[PDB]
Design a protein around this ligand. Sequence first.
Ligand SMILES: O=C(Nc1cc([C@@H]2CCCN2)[nH]n1)Nc1cccc2c1[C@@H]1CCCN1C2=O
Length: 273
Amino acid sequence: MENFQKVEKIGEGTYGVVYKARNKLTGEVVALKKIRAIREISLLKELNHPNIVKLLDVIHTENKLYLVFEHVHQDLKTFMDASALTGIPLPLIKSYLFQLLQGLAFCHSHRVLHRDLKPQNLLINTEGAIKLADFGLAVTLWYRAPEILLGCKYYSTAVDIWSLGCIFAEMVTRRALFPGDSEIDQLFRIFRTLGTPDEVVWPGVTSMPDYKPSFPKWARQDFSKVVPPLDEDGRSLLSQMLHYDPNKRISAKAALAHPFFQDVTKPVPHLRL
Ligand SMILES: O=C(Nc1cc([C@@H]2CCCN2)[nH]n1)Nc1cccc2c1[C@@H]1CCCN1C2=O
């Protein structure tokens, strides 16, 4: 719209492109997302929390839709790329995970799923906060829960916990946990690490629409091999976020009281700009 001046492309989102823009009327720098609903989006406008990027305005004009969000200094993927030589320090990984769980517990209690969590849409500021973006709107497959890969259409909030498990693991080891390049390769990288699932660990799995009896049968690896050198409290919380069965996967509210968070603090990151 004519009230905005775009400075540059910030990035592509699930349902559209995002630009950094300045709003002439306010002089504020903003993140402007041009889409490709009205009601489902206006609801999101009222979803405010410290760990959720704020939806400022919705502009439905000339049969077009633009969502105006607060602009956040940097994204987590850029931050992880910049720290891959020394790795993000643990006190910071723990702070970020804890704040992420708070925003997810808040969205989840309002029945709002994220569905596409990834480092690119996790936003961090100079003060140590982190925020969920590209939310409640509803291609990298790396953070996709197995139930989506197996063609389940009525998935739950547990899909977000799984994606968050994957990110947590990546922040610790500085390597993507399951970097698949197609849906079947994605499923197989998961099975190769966590074991091919069966009716014992995941009741109803052989009944998923895309489940095939011909899937190879792989043994599960130990998590101590998967996430060195995460401590035992961290590994145990992680194994609970990565349970195959969505009904057994830990919820965000429950994970907030896990012993891994006993010593959380909110350190300030060292970020370049
Ligand atoms: O506020 C920001 N800040 C930034 C900054 C950056 C960049 C990307 C390269 C360097 N840092 N991405 N996002 N981003 C932002 C704000 C509101 C909504 C969204 C986003 C991101 C961009 C990708 C999809 N996202 C959204 O749906």
